[PDB]
Amino acid sequence: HKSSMVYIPTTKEAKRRNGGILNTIEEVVEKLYWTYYIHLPFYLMASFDSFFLHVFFLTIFSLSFFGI
Amino acid sequence: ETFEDENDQQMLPNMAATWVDQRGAWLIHIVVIVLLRLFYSLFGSTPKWTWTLTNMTYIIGFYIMFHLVKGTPFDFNGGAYDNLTMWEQINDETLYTPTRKFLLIVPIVLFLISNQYYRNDMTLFLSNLAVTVLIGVVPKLGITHRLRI
Amino acid sequence: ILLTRKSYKPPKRPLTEQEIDELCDEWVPEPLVDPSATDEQSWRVAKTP
Question: How far separated are the first and last CA of chain B, in Å rounded?
Answer without folding.
Answer: 20
